[PDB]
Design an enzyme around this catalytic site. Structure first.
Site, PDB file in Angstrom:
ATOM      1  CG  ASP A   1      -1.848   0.556   1.169  1.00 14.27           C
ATOM      2  OD1 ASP A   1      -3.193   0.895   0.877  1.00 14.27           O
ATOM      3  OD2 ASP A   1      -1.794   2.153   2.030  1.00 14.27           O
TER       4      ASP A   1
ATOM      5  CG  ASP B   1      -3.437   3.846  -2.110  1.00 15.61           C
ATOM      6  OD1 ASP B   1      -2.541   2.561  -2.234  1.00 15.61           O
ATOM      7  OD2 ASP B   1      -4.543   4.775  -1.663  1.00 15.61           O
TER       8      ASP B   1
HETATM    9  C1  LIG Z   1     -13.351  -4.769  -2.624  1.00 13.11           C
HETATM   10  O1  LIG Z   1     -12.463  -3.205  -1.618  1.00 13.11           O
HETATM   11  C2  LIG Z   1     -12.493  -1.767  -3.260  1.00 13.11           C
HETATM   12  C3  LIG Z   1     -11.451  -1.829  -3.752  1.00 13.11           C
HETATM   13  N1  LIG Z   1     -10.945  -1.298  -2.646  1.00 13.11           N
HETATM   14  C4  LIG Z   1      -9.536  -1.910  -1.516  1.00 13.11           C
HETATM   15  C5  LIG Z   1      -8.133  -1.728  -2.059  1.00 13.11           C
HETATM   16  C6  LIG Z   1      -7.475  -2.948  -2.066  1.00 13.11           C
HETATM   17  C7  LIG Z   1      -7.821  -2.753  -2.906  1.00 13.11           C
HETATM   18  C8  LIG Z   1      -6.276  -2.468  -4.285  1.00 13.11           C
HETATM   19  C9  LIG Z   1     -10.564   0.122  -2.251  1.00 13.11           C
HETATM   20  C10 LIG Z   1      -9.381   0.583  -1.180  1.00 13.11           C
HETATM   21  C11 LIG Z   1      -9.891   1.988  -1.038  1.00 13.11           C
HETATM   22  C12 LIG Z   1      -9.211   2.961  -0.463  1.00 13.11           C
HETATM   23  N2  LIG Z   1      -9.073   3.321   0.735  1.00 13.11           N
HETATM   24  N3  LIG Z   1      -8.129   3.811   1.292  1.00 13.11           N
HETATM   25  C13 LIG Z   1      -6.764   3.224   1.055  1.00 13.11           C
HETATM   26  C14 LIG Z   1      -5.679   2.296   1.730  1.00 13.11           C
HETATM   27  C15 LIG Z   1      -5.758   4.124   1.768  1.00 13.11           C
HETATM   28  N4  LIG Z   1      -5.200   2.364  -0.186  1.00 13.11           N
HETATM   29  C16 LIG Z   1      -5.959   1.563   2.694  1.00 13.11           C
HETATM   30  C17 LIG Z   1      -6.696   0.381   2.426  1.00 13.11           C
HETATM   31  C18 LIG Z   1      -7.512   0.396   2.332  1.00 13.11           C
HETATM   32  C19 LIG Z   1      -9.383  -0.633   2.621  1.00 13.11           C
HETATM   33  C20 LIG Z   1      -8.401  -1.868   1.615  1.00 13.11           C
HETATM   34  C21 LIG Z   1      -6.997  -1.582   1.012  1.00 13.11           C
HETATM   35  C22 LIG Z   1      -6.231  -0.897   2.006  1.00 13.11           C
HETATM   36  O2  LIG Z   1      -7.356   2.365   0.149  1.00 13.11           O
HETATM   37  C23 LIG Z   1     -10.734   3.263  -1.974  1.00 13.11           C
HETATM   38 CL1  LIG Z   1     -10.793   4.762  -1.716  1.00 13.11          CL
HETATM   39  C24 LIG Z   1     -11.729   2.342  -3.040  1.00 13.11           C
HETATM   40  N5  LIG Z   1     -12.401   3.137  -3.916  1.00 13.11           N
HETATM   41  C25 LIG Z   1     -13.824   3.309  -2.980  1.00 13.11           C
HETATM   42  S1  LIG Z   1     -12.641   3.046  -5.228  1.00 13.11           S
HETATM   43  C26 LIG Z   1     -13.412   1.007  -5.798  1.00 13.11           C
HETATM   44  O3  LIG Z   1     -10.938   2.358  -5.408  1.00 13.11           O
HETATM   45  O4  LIG Z   1     -12.732   4.236  -6.005  1.00 13.11           O
HETATM   46  N6  LIG Z   1     -11.318   1.150  -2.589  1.00 13.11           N
END
Ligand SMILES: COCCN(C[C@H]1C[C@@H]1C)c1cc(-c2nnc([C@](C)(N)Cc3ccccc3)o2)c(Cl)c(N(C)S(C)(=O)=O)n1
EC number: 3.4.23.46
Length: 379
Positions: free
Chosen positions: A38, A222
């Site tokens: 991440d 990200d």
């Molecule tokens: C299945 O859920 C939808 C996809 N997914 C999960 C990500 C793992 C895949 C890349 C994910 C994570 C975040 C998101 N917000 N903040 C973060 C961090 C800082 N990377 C931390 C993190 C949080 C939760 C899970 C994994 C990692 O990510 C966000 Cl905005 C979104 N969106 C709403 S989207 C569909 O991409 O528009 N989707």
């Protein structure tokens, strides 16, 4: 051509929809877990208690080298949040650098909408800077500990491959993972991996928005976010342009909002009718920029196939954000991305696993002349 970093190639598994993860071994004796790569956060944390979506978790009592910091931590993201206990323990990456360091590790004891069913990862490796770490910037991030405790060069690169894995090269660059040249954009500030987008084109046509809108708030890279997330005003303009460019076939309004999916018979998706998107990034020399071009195969992502059926379903992977632009995994998938922390820059090159067709290919091209790029950033 050759590969001194060969043992790190293919050390990632996963996909854009659920995340890419690497194996990390923590404690003594060894406890290996699957960890989400991440670049959008800075905390290293692992599930430390049973959870419906977790196949395994960190058992601190079994680690003789674990040191409880006697302090809790709460971390909320745009999506999901978790609470845990802070501590430190020995950490190594089996298929990463040949070193072992003592790093801060948060043991996740409770969470809400964080872990994902079927993702196969049980923790998260925040690779961003200390400024955005929780509880505060005094909690040294994993990569910072790695660089301070070892001679591993301050840089890592990511090759995320979609369709089902990838590579995270730590300490260097692997030339077999990309073709053509690497183009660098400066890391504007060391907190998130912030960059500056100076121009956006849809099928060669300039979106014509004041570039400040492209980075309103900030623009970051990200690897742990699926979509290309854009500020409201930019999102609306991009969708209107994309819809116009793909007028051959009509799609319901909800499709562009991620509310509806569209499926095609196996192997019949008309990629050619969808436009390519070009994002121009500030270069390393005054008034010089370069662009990365995104194909529809990137912004139209397959939704976990029903069960080997004769229909490939897709979801529009471009959405809106109220916290700036986020270049997520679907964007990174077409490229080999170098997070050159040492020189405060991020490089892009055509990925060796770029998913293109016989008509078009993802690309990184330059240089272009772009004046007043500094004014595109938000203050
Ligand atoms: C299945 O859920 C939808 C996809 N997914 C999960 C990500 C793992 C895949 C890349 C994910 C994570 C975040 C998101 N917000 N903040 C973060 C961090 C800082 N990377 C931390 C993190 C949080 C939760 C899970 C994994 C990692 O990510 C966000 Cl905005 C979104 N969106 C709403 S989207 C569909 O991409 O528009 N989707």
């Amino acid at each position: 051509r050759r590969g001194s970093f060969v043992e790190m190639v293919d050390n990632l598994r996963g996909k854009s929809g659920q995340g890419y993860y690497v194996e990390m071994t923590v404690g003594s004796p060894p406890q290996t877990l699957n960890i989400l790569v991440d670049t959008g956060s800075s905390n290293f944390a692992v599930g430390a208690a049973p959870h419906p979506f977790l196949h395994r978790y960190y058992q601190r009592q079994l680690s003789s080298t674990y040191r409880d910091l006697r302090k809790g931590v709460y971390v909320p993201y745009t999506q999901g949040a978790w609470a845990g206990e802070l501590g430190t323990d020995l950490v190594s990456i089996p298929h990463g650098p040949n070193v072992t360091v003592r790093a801060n590790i948060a043991a996740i004891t409770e969470s809400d909408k964080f872990f994902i069913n079927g993702s196969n990862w049980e923790g998260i490796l925040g690779l961003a800077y200390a400024e955005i770490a929780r509880p505060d910037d005094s909690l040294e991030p994993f990569f910072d500990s790695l660089v301070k405790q070892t001679h591993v060069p301050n840089l890592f690169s990511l090759q995320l491959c979609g369709a089902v894995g990838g590579s995270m090269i730590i300490g260097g660059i692997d030339h077999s993972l990309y073709t053509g040249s690497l183009w660098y954009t400066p890391i504007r500030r060391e907190w998130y991996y912030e960059v500056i987008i100076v121009r956006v084109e849809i099928n060669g046509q300039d979106l014509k928005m004041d570039c400040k809108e492209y980075n309103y708030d900030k623009s970051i890279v990200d690897s742990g976010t699926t979509n290309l997330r854009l500020p409201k005003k930019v999102f609306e303009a991009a969708v209107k342009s994309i819809k116009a460019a793909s007028s051959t076939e009509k799609f319901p309004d909800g499709f562009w909002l991620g509310e509806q999916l569209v499926c095609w018979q196996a192997g019949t998706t008309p990629w050619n009718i969808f436009p390519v998107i070009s994002l121009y990034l500030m270069g390393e020399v005054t008034n010089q920029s370069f662009r990365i071009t995104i194909l529809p195969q990137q912004y139209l992502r397959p939704v976990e196939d029903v069960a080997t059926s004769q229909d490939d379903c897709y979801k529009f992977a471009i959405s809106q954000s109220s916290t700036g632009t986020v270049m997520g995994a679907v964007i990174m998938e077409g490229f080999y991305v170098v997070f050159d922390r040492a020189r405060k820059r991020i490089g892009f090159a055509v990925s060796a696993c770029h998913v293109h067709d016989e008509f078009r290919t993802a690309a990184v091209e330059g240089p272009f002349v772009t004046l007043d790029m500094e004014d595109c950033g938000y203050n």
